[PDB]
Every structure is written in structure tokens, then in C-alpha cells.
Paper text:
The HSV-1 DNA polymerase, encoded by the UL30 gene, forms a 190kDa heterodimeric complex with its processivity factor UL42 protein. The HSV-1 UL30 is a family B DNA polymerase containing a 5′-3′ polymerase activity and a proofreading 3′-5′ exonuclease activity. The UL30 DNA polymerase has the characteristic fold of many polymerases, and although there is little sequence conservation, the UL42 protein is structurally similar to a single PCNA subunit but does not form a ring-like clamp. UL42, which binds directly to DNA, instead interacts as a monomer with the extreme C-terminus of UL30 (26) and promotes processive DNA synthesis.
In this state, we introduced either a 1-bp or 2-bp mismatch accompanied by a phosphorothioate bond and replaced Mg2+ with Ca2+ to halt exonuclease activity. With the movement of the DNA to the exonuclease state, the entire polymerase core ‘opens up’. The thumb and exonuclease domains move apart, allowing for the DNA to shift between active sites. The single-stranded template DNA extending in the ssDNA-channel between the NH2-terminal and exonuclease domains visible in the pre-translocation state and halted elongation state structures is not entirely resolved in either of the exonuclease state structures. The β-hairpin loop position is well conserved between the two different exonuclease structures, strengthening our assignment. The 1-bp mismatch active site closely resembles the exonuclease active site with the 2-bp mismatch DNA. The side chains adopt similar or identical orientations, and Y577 adopts a double conformation also in this structure. The DNA in the exonuclease state active site is better resolved in the 1-bp mismatch structure as compared to the 2-bp mismatch structure. It is, however, shifted compared to its canonical position adopted by the 2-bp mismatch structure.
Author numbering:
A (entry chain B): 28 to 226, 252 to 318
B (entry chain A): 59 to 504, 512 to 639, 700 to 1094, 1133 to 1235
The structure:
DNA sequence: GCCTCGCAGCCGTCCAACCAACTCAA
DNA sequence: GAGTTGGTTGGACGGCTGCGAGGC
């Protein structure tokens, strides 16, 4: 068979379907980046950076050889490679393969699809097959390192923070962590406060509560982005030891999607 | 006394409307040099030439132009005792006029002619030339038109019992006519006799008695044929007196050599006295048809004269860049070039330039003509448009050129001149042809037609659009294509500037006008259009003027009329063949029926007179043996076979084809001059034979028979299917082919054998010969075609092997591209070069086609595409070999993005039709460039001419300069009309060309051809062609900078493989 | 009280139908 | 004066955001 092969069926396929179910149409136009670690999916929503890592551990079979590969999700500017994972696209779906063949930088990905039929038997849904050659060259910029602070918020709490965020550049939003774990988010009007502690509606759990900080965002798309992505509770991850500080919000529901927002001024 | 009939052309004039440009008043102040003078001047029309001056209408010794006229205004200018003896003369045209014995009573005509026109009668005038170059008119008396009516129907309707009754009934219908336009008609204006004839329609039709009625005038006949007994069918009422003269005298022709001879009672032709001349001839005769014979042997054309002319016009209104309209007094004719040739020697004899205002031809031009051995131009200068137009018409009357040519002369030059003379100046035109008054001189619109009595008008635009296939038929393009001459040009735009500048600059307009006429003369003597037109005139039995301006029907009608009369007839007055588109690299043999529709008519004996619509008409005959039965348009039709009754159409076609074969047998053993005449003759027979089927199919035409036309197509369709079924059944296996044609053993190629019809259209089929080599297939094809012809079809039906393709692309019905075994590429129904496209796309589109046909790697790979549905190629890698085809598209894409390019390769262009404020839609690309030039560049924008432009990529500077509010006196993503830019600006600032615009146009050009490789699906074709291009992805420059300052690491290019890999390991660890 | 479910409105993308514009003859 | 093409108007399909309010 192919030198590079990825397979989903049964429990692993149900895992990926559950991961895409809340994401709806938000990832259909995107960059797929593939290597020995897994598939990293990249997009920008309202100008903000968005990532979905799929680890090799989440596939029925995952086998890779040779360099990293990158593919744009759109085929012939119409159909998306990621369509198969939308919540109701193929109701009878049973198994999915990616086969990647050839020599860099001219490898081709072929995606194949199987559905359930009489007596539960698999049939290849051959009309739906997609083929895409890798990008001849590409550059993508990715997060790296460990965040200075991490805080976990529920389905409530996170929706309170999003509502407390300023509506526009006319009113910037401050995120702050004060003495004795007093997490707060506020602007010229709205304010919310929580009690952070190390790893009850006011309580928050985090990895590094001692590191006090205060940071601003002043063109804040994040209430648009995180509701577009339907994030049902997540981890706020702060990068503070950096010329442009950043907030990465990672979802903690069925979806492990992350969005990264640049902060100000520090 | 003066002339018997008044001369209506101007021989004297002493007042006229003086119209002239005020700019010719070269001493007037700058305020008063615009527009035209327009008023009435009491002066004789003047002409100036070389410092001398003359009256335009004075005839005498010192004239500025040549003459071939004997009479002028009723004065005889022939030398004393001028009296040529005429034996032989050539006829080029035939007039038809009415003369009255009362009008001609002062002329000293013999009684036998006066009898033929008492009280009125039709005279046939033969126009011609003697071997000594004398202009002749021979007036033939005694020809009468006639028509038929059924005797039983007339006797039962009008209660007639003898022919004299019918004569009085007709006289009554004319006496009682509205307005009494036929006052004084009598039974003596008629003759009627009883004759037996058959209606030409239907086989069952019995002979019957008819009244043959003779008449003295076509005016009377054309009233009787619709105003008198409309319920009673009439026969041959539409036949003109010229046709009766030609058909009723065996051997007579409308173009050719004649001899005068003694008639029945030893009567001779009478020479007219000068004051009885009806025309501008040197000698005229009265005769009857028995005074004439065809002169055998004589065949050389005599010294007829050709005028090649061209007008130049200047608009005089509020915009001199508007196209001139003759009905506007201020839109003048300013110059007329007029070249006079001998039509027999082809020599240029005179070069005349008529000029409104003074005009000094360049010494350069005079030297060029002298070096070429051509006549020195004579420049005729006039103070006003009327004096110039009068002088030109005076030349046309006095020199009397028998043939007239030019480029667009029927559609522009004559209509403009004659509109001026009629509408502005009120001049009567009826005396300016060959007749001295009451002749036809008329233009009318369909584009246009012209009739001028005694003048054969042949416009070279019609000749060349019929003969040569070209992108453009401007005289410039034709001169480059046909003559290979790179001639200069003066746009109407430059004309008004040159005209105002002075006599030297009006001389440059004159040079250009003369050079235009010299090129048209060269076209005329290359194609020799008078020789093909006269060959058709001789064959069809009609005059040369009708050959040019009447349609195809009258040619067949007149030949049928001659034959029908000899036979006793009278004429009454009125999906399996579809192409599976794709590419073949096995050889394809083309079988073609020689003259399919004429040969069906002959083989099946189809005619008006062999047709029956009724079974009882053929009950005495045996089916199949004595007649064809055929279902046509749902009706059952019967056609009796040639031994029962021979078809008139079949006899015409057979006799013409025998004549054509005989002529073409003589061509190889004939002189270089004879071979030209014989070639024109064989070509005339082909055009007439091909028109027979069409003649039967014109509903409401002359003598229609839709049953015959529909039968011809029905038989033709069945013959293709029969040929197909025979080929498929006879040569299904290689052993069967080899048993018929033993050289097939040498032809056998690798792979499976088959023969299948892949395409068929009207008279041709294409047979794919899988598993054979191309080399022998033309020779075996001749034997296949011969075998099929003898197996299936009656002579003269003949299938022929036309050609063998080695490679063929079937695109659609009547659309394909192929390569013939002799290496030549052939294209049908497709244009690979587009007028509106830049050079880059035309050249690259043609390179993709050349590659498909001339790299066997790509040809073989393209042929493999047919093995799978078009949709299936979306989901699997394309064949091995098309990678060389993809490389052309990759190189083309690269060649747009390359910075070192010649921007000229990508230039589009358009002309402003009017001043930019007057446009309805402001987004038209070339308008953007006008405003960008005048505002952003602050340069002078080009005035009402061709703007060149290119399409640029959207950037800053472009987004800013789109705020062109100076146009009065969408911004996120610009439109193509906004992205238009000036090429000089684009070069100077190194501006990037729009990759999406040019490459999407290149794919748009490519897909229209390569659709055939992918089941005609344009979306699949375009999608698969995009996939060859290398896709790349990067974040925007600003975004990349921000993310690097946010500590993001780079994955992909610009780093080693392990750096990219380890960076992804970091990315998955952070995003956990 | 508050999580989540459906309806009603807005937007982008798309195919279709239509229009005004060249090009030409001096 | 008849064929092509870049732009405008229009309705429909599909998917998302915001409001109201049913079930727990
Ligand atoms: Ca002309
Ligand atoms: Ca002209």
C-alpha cells in the first residue's frame, strides 16, 4: 500500500465525528499539516488564528514516512476534504482512509469513504472520493512553548467572560490576575471576578496561580470567534514572557479546538 | 431639329448650387474658414487642370479627360465622312425598351421596323464593340412576350369561342384600368392562337389546349398577369423579352460574338442616322433576329474599358470625426480617384484624380508611378462639389466604361454619389448610362444593389469575401493577404486635418486615394471576375447584370425553360451518425459523396414531371421496376423511372456534367490563355449544377417543388445509413477486409482490428480503422469507396476516399481538428485565434493544440482519457504523458509573473466610439485608462482613437488612484475595468500583471478545444487543467511579522526537515 | 433560575437573464 | 449590422446570529 496511510473506523471514527460535531462549517476552508505526530489543522476566523490538532493516537491506524506535508482543504475550489466529518454529511459513515503517495514536494493525498449497508456490510462510496496534491511550498506560523498561566472555565464562567468582554475597539478589555487568586475580566462598563486556585460557581482551577499579571486586548474579536467555534468551556492560556503577549483559548468539550488572540501592550 | 428622343443628361448648364469648404479661402481671416458656403451661382461649371481652365460640358479638342462619344447634346463630333462597316461585333449587355411608331415617325426607319412598333412594340438592344473598338448598338425588332391560359377554363369563364374574343376581353380589362394608364389599347395590341401543351407538374397530367397570347409590351403583360382573371392560372407570364429573344433563336447568347447577315427575304440591317441614335454609340443598326448569327471561332474579348474608382468624403458638421451622410449638404465628396484600363490587354491607360480645391501630388508619388511605367496622373481641380460631381458623371457618359469596379462601390461609393446628385443637386440620372434618356440608373438597399443600363458594376468586396477566407476584409488586410503589399493608410480621422492644411496636404490625400484604386485594379486582374460572370451568363442564358444581382434561381429557371419548351411543357406562374466527441490516434478514413444532391436527382430520375402524389397515377406500372415509392414528410410519393419518362432536371444535370468533363479533358493540352478560359467555364458549370437542389426547395420561389427537395434529402439520409450498415457488416473482422483487399496484410498494426463509422454529416462519413497503419489506407480507401459505390448505389452516385487522418479530435457536429497523413493540420468549425485576445493567449492556445498533435507521448496519453467517464478523472491521477502538456500551462502561468517580460505581449485595445461623457456604462476598461491618463498621469489622453491597455494586480496605489473623482466635471475587491492600466506606465513603474485575469482567459481559450477529451464537461476540463499549477500558501506580511513577535515558530519552507518536525512537536504540546 | 432548542432575519455565494459596449464603412 | 464579453439585477440555497421561551 501507500508509504503514508491514516485510517478511521468504529470507536476512533466516532471520536473524530464528536470532535467535528460542534465545529460545523468553521474548518472547511483550512490548511492541513501532516507529520509523524498527527494532523494539525489551521485556519483564521475574523482575522484571529485557529488550530485543531488531531494526534496520531486518535486514529485506527497512523503511519508516516518522509517530510511534513501540507494540503489546502478545498479541492477544485468547491468540495472540502473535511466535509466527511460534518455532523450529518454522510449518516451511514463506517470508515475513512487517507492515502498519501509519491515523492516530495509532489505527493498526492487521496481520501476514501465507506458506508454501512445491508447486514452492516461496508461499501466504498466511490463518487465522493477526493484527490489533492501537496503545496509545492508553504509557510505556517504555530504556537510553541509553555504558557505562563493556565485557568480552566466551565460552560458558565466562560460565557460570563465572553459577555463581560468589550464589544469593539472603542472599549478595550482587561484580563487580570491579582493577589490571592483574584481573576477578573473588565472594561469601561462590565466586570466579572473569580477565585482561582491550584489544580462553587465563582471557583476557578489553574496550573500557576501565583503569577500575577494584567493584560489588555483592544480589537477584541474573541466573543465572535469562540461562539462561532461553539466553545463549551475551555482553558485560558496566557503567554506573558514575550514581546507581544498572547491568549490561547483551548476548548475542553468534545472538540479540542484552540484560538489564539494577540494582546497589548507588554 | 436635334435628336428624335431628347437627351436627358446635361450638355449645358449655367446655374447651380455652389457648395464648398470655407477653408479653401486661404486669404480669409481665421474666424471665417469653418463650415461650407452654400448658395446658387450663375456661372458655367468650370474645371482647372495644369494652369488651364475649361467648361465641364464643352466638347472639343483640348479636353482634360478621354472620350469615346460620337454625339454630345445632339451635335455629331465624328470626323467628316465617318462611316465604319460592321460585320462582326461582340455583345456584352442586352437592353429591353418600348418604342412607339408615333414617337419614331421622324426617324427614317424602314417599314418592316415601324410595323413591329405600330402602335407600340418591344425592342431588344444588343450593346457591344467591333474588333476596331467602335461602340455598337444593334436594335432588334419583332420579339414579342407571350403567356398561356387553359382554353377550356378561359372559354368557360369569359364565354370566349374564338381567339379574337379573348383579345377584346383583355383590351376591355385594360381600357377599364384604374387611372386609365392603358388608354387606347385595342384587340390589335394582341394575337392569340390555340396550341397543345402540358403543365410541367405531375406525371398523370394530360396534354390540353391552351391559348398562347402574344403581347407588345411588358407593361401590358404585368397588368394582365395579376389584374385579369385572377382565378385562371397563367403560364410563363414572368418571362422577359430578352429571354424570349435568346430561347426562340437557337444558339443565341447574352455575351459573345455575333455577325450581321441577310435575312429571310434578303433583307439587311439598316444603319440609323445619328439624330435617331438611342445610345452613346459610334454606330447603331435596326435589324430583325434573322439578320443575326453567332460568330463561331471568335472568342477573344475586345477592347472594352474598365473604370476603377474610389471616392473620399469629409464630414462638415459639428464633429468632423462623425461618419459622413450624403443627405447632409455639409458632408462633401472631396476627391474621386478614377483609373481607366483596357480590359483586353489589362493595361492602365489613364489615372484621373478629381479634387475639390487645389491639389499638388507629392513628387515621391509621381516618381513611384513613373518608375512602375504607369500613366502620369491628371489632377482635375474644382471650386465646388457640384462641378466635380458633374465632371465625373460627364466622364462616365463620354468615356462610357463598359465595366466598373472598386472596393465597396455598391455599398458606399455609388449610393453616396447618387444621393448627392439626386437629393442635393436634383440632377436626372436616366441619361447617364448607355441610353441617352429614359434608361435605368438605380441603387437600392437589401448592403445594396445597383443597375446602370449598359454598365457592368463588379465590386471587389463581393468577389473577395466569396473567394478568400480572412479575419478582416479591409482593403489593407486584403492587400497584405492576397497581393503581399504593405501599403500605407489615412484614417478618416486624419483626413479633415490634411484637407485644411493646404494643396500639398490635399496632395497626400490624393496619393492615398490613387494607391487605393491601384490595389483594387491589381485584385481585379488577379481574380478576373468578369470572366467567371460572363461564363455563367453564357451558360444560363441571362444577361451579365442579372447574373451578378439576381439570385441563383433565375439561372436554373432559364435553362429549365429552354428544355421544357422542347419537350412540350409549360411552366405555371407563382442520431446514430452524431459524433461521440473524443481523440483518435488510430487512423480515420474520410469517405465523401461526389456531388451527392445532383447525383441523387439523376440516379432516381426526380422531377416536377416524373412525380405523382397518387397511387392511381401509377396503377398501370410495376412497383420498383417502373417507379420508386418513397415516404417523405409522412406522405407516400411516386417517381417514375427514366424509361417511363426522363426527368428534365436529370437531363439538365447530365448534359452539364458531360460538358464539364469534356472541358476539363482539354485543359492539359491547351495554351496558358486557353487554360484560363476553360477553367472559368468548368467553374461556371459547377456553380449552376450545385444550385439545382436549392432551386426546387425555395418556397414561394420560381417553380418550387418541395416534394423533390424533401425526396433528395430523404434519399441522402438513407444512403449514409446504408453505407454505415454495409461497412459494419462487410468488414467487422480483419480477415473479411483482407479477402476483399489483399494489401491489408501489409497495413496490419499492433492492437485489435475494427472498422467503425465515428461521424457523418450530409455527404461524408468518417471511418475509424483501428489496428491498421495509415500508410496504405488511402489506396485501400479508393478500393473500399469503389466497392461500396458498385454494391449499394446507381450511377452516377459515387463515394470517394477524400483523405486519411493520422490523428483526429472530434469536438462536435461540424467541429473537429485533425492531421492528414501528408503532415498537414486541418481545422473545421473552430477558431484558434481570437481578435480580442492578447498575443500571449492566442500563441499559448495554439501551442497546446500543436503539442496534442505533434508529441506522440501527449497524443497517446490524451487517447487514454476516453477509457473512463469524465467524472472519474477527478478522483485518480491523469495518464502518463500529459505531464508535458501540463508543463506548458505551468510555463504560461510563470510567464505572467516573470518581471523581465515584454508587457506588449499582454496588450488589449479598444477605440472610443464617442467622447467619454456620452457613455451609459462607465466601467469599460479603456475609459479607466482615459481617466488615469488625464488625471493620475496628467498626460494628454488620446482623442477618439485606439487606447492600448493591460490588466494589473490589485495593490496600494491602484486602490488609491481608483478614487478618480476627476471623472465628474467596489473598494474591498476591484473589478477588471478598475484594474485596467496604460502599458507605458506599466513598463515604467514595473507594475505586476493580473495573474487571475490572464490565466483564467488562457484556460477559457483552452477548454473550448479540450472539452472533447473530458466528455464536453467545461467544469471538469477547467478543474483538471488548474491542477497542473503549483499551489503555495503563506500568511500576509503584516500577520507573519506580528506572529513572529508573539513567539510563534515557522513550520514549512525556510527551515530544515528536522526543524519543521521538532516545531510541529512543540505545536502539538502547546495546543494540548 | 438557566441551559438549549426552534424560528425569523441577514449575509455570502451562485446561476441565470439581461444590457451596453466593440467592430466598419470614409 | 450580428457575435462576444464584462457588468448589473434578481431570486434562491445554505449557513450563522439573535430572540424568545420550554423543560428541568
Ligand atoms: Ca471605396
Ligand atoms: Ca474611399
Amino acid at each position: 500500500g501507500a508509504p503514508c496511510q491514516v485510517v478511521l473506523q468504529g470507536a476512533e471514527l466516532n471520536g473524530i465525528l464528536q470532535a467535528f460535531a460542534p465545529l460545523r462549517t468553521s474548518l472547511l476552508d483550512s490548511l492541513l499539516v501532516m507529520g509523524d505526530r498527527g494532523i494539525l489543522i489551521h485556519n483564521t476566523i475574523f482575522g484571529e488564528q485557529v488550530f485543531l490538532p488531531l494526534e496520531h493516537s486518535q486514529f485506527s491506524r497512523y503511519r508516516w514516512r518522509g517530510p511534513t506535508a501540507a494540503f489546502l482543504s478545498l479541492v477544485d475550489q468547491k468540495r472540502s476534504l473535511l466535509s466527511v466529518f460534518r455532523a450529518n454529511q454522510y449518516p451511514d459513515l463506517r470508515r475513512v482512509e487517507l492515502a498519501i503517495t509519491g515523492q516530495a514536494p509532489f505527493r498526492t493525498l487521496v481520501q476514501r469513504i465507506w458506508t454501512t449497508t445491508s447486514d452492516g456490510e461496508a461499501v466504498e462510496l466511490a463518487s465522493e472520493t477526493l484527490m489533492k496534491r501537496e503545496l509545492t511550498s508553504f509557510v505556517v506560523l504555530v504556537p510553541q512553548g509553555t504558557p505562563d498561566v493556565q485557568l480552566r472555565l466551565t460552560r458558565p464562567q466562560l460565557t460570563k467572560v465572553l459577555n463581560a468582554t468589550g464589544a469593539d475597539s472603542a472599549t478595550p478589555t482587561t484580563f487580570e490576575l491579582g493577589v490571592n487568586g483574584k481573576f477578573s475580566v473588565f472594561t469601561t462598563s462590565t466586570c466579572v471576578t473569580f477565585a482561582a486556585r491550584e489544580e462553587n460557581a465563582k471557583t476557578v482551577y489553574g496550573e500557576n496561580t501565583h503569577r500575577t499579571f494584567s493584560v489588555v486586548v483592544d480589537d477584541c474579536s474573541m466573543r465572535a470567534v469562540l461562539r462561532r467555534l461553539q466553545v463549551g468551556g475551555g482553558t485560558l492560556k496566557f503567554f506573558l514572557t514575550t514581546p507581544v503577549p498572547s491568549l490561547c483559548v483551548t476548548a475542553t468539550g468534545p472538540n479540542a479546538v484552540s484560538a489564539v488572540f494577540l494582546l497589548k501592550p507588554q | 431639329t436635334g435628336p428624335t428622343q431628347r437627351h436627358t443628361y446635361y450638355s449645358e448648364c449655367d446655374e447651380f448650387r455652389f457648395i464648398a469648404p470655407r477653408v479653401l479661402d486661404e486669404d480669409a481671416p481665421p474666424e471665417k474658414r469653418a463650415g461650407v458656403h452654400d448658395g446658387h451661382l450663375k456661372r458655367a461649371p468650370k474645371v482647372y487642370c495644369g494652369g488651364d481652365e475649361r467648361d465641364v460640358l464643352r466638347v472639343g479638342s483640348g479636353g482634360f479627360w478621354p472620350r469615346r462619344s460620337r454625339l454630345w447634346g445632339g451635335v455629331d463630333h465624328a470626323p467628316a465622312g465617318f462611316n465604319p462597316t460592321v460585320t462582326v461585333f461582340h455583345v456584352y449587355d442586352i437592353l429591353e425598351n418600348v418604342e412607339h411608331a408615333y414617337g419614331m415617325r421622324a426617324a427614317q426607319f424602314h417599314a418592316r421596323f415601324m410595323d413591329a412598333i405600330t402602335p407600340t412594340g418591344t425592342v431588344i438592344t444588343l450593346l457591344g464593340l467591333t474588333p476596331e473598338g467602335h461602340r455598337v448598338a444593334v436594335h432588334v425588332y419583332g420579339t414579342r412576350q407571350y403567356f398561356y391560359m387553359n382554353k377550356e377554363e378561359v372559354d368557360r369563364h369569359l364565354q370566349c369561342r374564338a381567339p379574337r374574343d379573348l383579345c377584346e376581353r383583355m383590351a376591355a380589362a385594360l381600357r377599364e384600368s384604374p387611372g386609365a394608364s392603358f388608354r387606347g389599347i385595342s384587340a390589335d395590341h394582341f394575337e392569340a392562337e390555340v396550341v397543345e401543351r402540358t403543365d410541367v407538374y405531375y406525371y398523370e397530367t394530360r396534354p390540353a389546349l391552351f391559348y398562347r397570347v402574344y403581347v407588345r409590351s411588358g407593361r401590358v403583360l404585368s397588368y394582365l398577369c395579376d389584374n385579369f382573371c385572377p382565378a385562371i392560372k397563367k403560364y410563363e407570364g414572368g418571362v422577359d423579352a430578352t429571354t424570349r429573344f435568346i430561347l426562340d433563336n437557337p444558339g443565341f447568347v447574352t455575351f459573345g460574338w455575333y455577325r450581321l447577315k441577310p435575312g429571310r427575304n434578303n433583307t439587311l440591317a439598316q444603319p440609323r442616322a445619328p439624330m435617331a441614335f438611342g445610345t452613346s454609340s459610334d454606330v447603331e443598326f435596326n435589324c430583325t433576329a434573322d439578320n443575326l448569327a453567332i460568330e463561331g471561332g471568335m472568342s477573344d474579348l475586345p477592347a472594352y474599358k474598365l473604370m476603377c474608382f474610389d471616392i473620399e468624403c469629409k464630414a462638415g458638421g459639428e464633429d468632423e470625426l462623425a461618419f459622413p451622410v450624403a443627405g447632409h449638404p455639409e458632408d462633401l465628396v472631396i476627391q474621386i480617384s478614377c483609373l481607366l484600363y483596357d480590359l483586353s490587354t489589362t493595361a492602365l491607360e489613364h489615372v484621373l484624380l478629381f479634387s475639390l480645391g487645389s491639389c499638388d501630388l507629392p513628387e515621391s508619388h509621381l516618381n513611384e508611378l513613373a518608375a512602375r511605367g504607369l500613366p502620369t496622373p491628371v489632377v482635375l481641380e474644382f471650386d465646388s462639389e457640384f462641378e466635380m460631381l458633374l465632371a465625373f458623371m460627364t466622364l462616365v457618359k463620354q468615356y462610357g466604361p463598359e465595366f466598373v469596379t472598386g472596393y465597396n462601390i455598391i455599398n458606399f461609393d455609388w449610393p453616396f454619389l447618387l444621393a448627392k446628385l439626386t437629393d442635393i443637386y436634383k440632377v436626372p440620372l436616366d441619361g447617364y448610362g448607355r441610353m441617352n434618356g429614359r434608361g435605368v440608373f438605380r441603387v437600392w438597399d437589401i448592403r445594396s444593389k445597383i443597375k446602370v443600363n449598359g454598365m457592368v458594376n463588379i465590386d471587389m468586396y463581393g468577389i473577395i469575401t466569396d473567394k478568400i477566407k480572412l479575419s478582416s476584409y479591409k482593403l489593407n488586410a486584403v492587400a497584405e493577404a492576397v497581393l503581399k503589399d504593405k501599403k500605407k493608410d489615412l484614417s478618416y480621422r486624419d483626413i479633415p486635418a490634411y484637407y485644411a492644411a493646404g494643396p500639398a496636404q490635399r496632395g497626400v490625400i490624393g496619393e492615398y486615394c490613387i494607391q487605393d484604386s491601384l490595389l483594387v485594379g491589381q485584385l481585379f486582374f488577379k481574380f478576373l471576375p468578369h470572366l467567371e460572370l460572363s461564363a455563367v451568363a453564357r451558360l444560363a442564358g441571362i444577361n451579365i447584370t442579372r447574373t451578378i444581382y439576381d439570385g441563383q434561381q433565375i439561372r436554373v429557371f432559364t435553362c429549365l425553360l429552354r428544355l421544357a419548351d422542347q419537350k412540350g411543357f409549360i411552366l405555371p406562374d407563382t442520431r446514430v451518425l452524431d459524433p461521440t466527441s473524443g481523440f483518435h490516434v488510430n487512423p480515420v478514413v474520410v469517405f465523401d459523396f461526389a456531388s451527392l444532391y445532383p447525383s441523387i436527382i439523376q440516379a432516381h430520375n426526380l422531377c416536377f414531371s416524373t412525380l405523382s402524389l397518387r397511387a392511381d397515377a401509377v396503377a398501370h406500372l410495376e412497383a420498383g421496376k417502373d417507379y420508386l415509392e418513397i415516404e417523405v414528410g409522412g406522405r407516400r410519393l411516386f417517381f417514375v423511372k427514366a424509361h417511363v419518362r426522363e426527368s428534365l432536371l436529370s437531363i439538365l444535370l447530365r448534359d452539364w456534367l458531360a460538358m464539364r468533363k469534356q472541358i476539363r479533358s482539354r485543359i492539359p493540352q491547351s495554351s496558358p490563355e486557353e487554360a484560363v478560359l476553360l477553367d472559368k467555364q468548368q467553374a461556371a458549370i459547377k456553380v449552376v449544377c450545385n444550385s439545382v437542389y436549392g432551386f426546387t426547395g425555395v418556397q414561394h420561389g420560381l417553380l418550387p417543388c418541395l416534394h423533390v427537395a424533401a425526396t433528395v434529402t430523404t434519399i441522402g439520409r438513407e444512403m449514409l445509413l446504408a453505407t454505415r450498415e454495409y461497412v459494419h457488416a462487410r468488414w467487422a473482422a480483419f480477415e473479411q477486409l483482407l479477402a476483399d483487399f489483399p494489401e491489408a496484410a501489409d497495413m496490419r498494426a499492433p492492437g485489435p482490428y475494427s472498422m467503425r463509422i465515428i461521424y457523418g454529416d450530409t455527404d461524408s462519413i468518417f471511418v475509424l480503422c483501428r489496428g491498421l497503419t495509415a500508410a496504405g489506407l488511402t489506396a485501400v480507401g479508393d478500393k473500399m469507396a469503389s466497392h461500396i459505390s458498385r454494391a449499394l448505389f446507381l450511377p452516377p452516385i459515387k463515394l470517394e476516399c477524400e483523405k486519411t487522418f493520422t490523428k483526429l479530435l472530434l469536438i462536435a457536429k461540424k467541429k473537429y481538428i485533425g492531421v492528414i497523413y501528408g503532415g498537414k493540420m486541418l481545422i473545421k468549425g473552430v477558431d484558434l485565434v481570437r481578435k480580442n485576445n492578447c498575443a500571449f493567449i492566442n500563441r499559448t492556445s495554439r501551442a497546446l493544440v500543436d503539442l496534442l498533435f505533434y508529441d506522440d507521448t501527449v497524443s497517446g496519453a490524451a487517447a487514454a482519457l476516453a477509457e473512463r467517464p469524465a467524472e472519474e478523472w477527478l478522483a485518480r491521477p491523469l495518464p502518463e504523458g500529459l505531464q508535458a502538456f501540463g508543463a506548458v500551462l505551468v510555463d504560461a502561468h510563470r510567464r505572467i509573473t516573470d518581471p523581465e517580460r515584454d508587457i506588449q505581449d499582454f496588450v488589449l485595445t479598444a477605440e472610443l466610439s464617442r467622447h467619454p461623457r456620452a457613455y451609459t456604462n462607465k466601467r469599460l476598461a479603456h475609459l479607466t485608462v482615459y481617466y488615469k491618463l488625464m488625471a493620475r498621469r496628467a498626460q494628454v489622453p488620446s482623442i477618439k482613437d485606439r487606447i492600448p491597455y493591460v490588466i494589473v494586480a490589485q495593490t496600494r496605489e491602484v486602490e488609491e488612484t481608483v478614487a478618480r473623482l476627476a471623472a465628474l466635471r467596489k473598494p474591498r475587491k476591484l473589478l477588471v475595468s478598475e484594474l485596467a492600466e496604460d502599458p507605458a506606465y506599466a513598463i515604467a513603474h514595473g507594475v505586476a500583471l493580473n495573474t487571475d485575469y490572464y490565466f483564467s482567459h488562457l484556460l477559457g481559450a483552452a477548454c473550448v478545444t479540450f472539452k472533447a477529451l473530458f466528455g464536453n464537461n467545461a467544469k471538469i476540463t477547467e478543474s483538471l487543467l488548474k491542477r497542473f499549477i503549483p499551489e503555495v500558501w503563506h500568511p500576509p506580511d503584516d500577520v507573519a511579522a506580528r506572529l513572529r513577535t508573539a513567539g510563534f515558530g515557522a513550520v514549512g519552507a525556510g527551515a530544515t526537515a528536522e526543524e519543521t518536525r521538532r516545531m510541529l512537536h512543540r505545536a502539538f504540546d502547546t495546543l494540548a
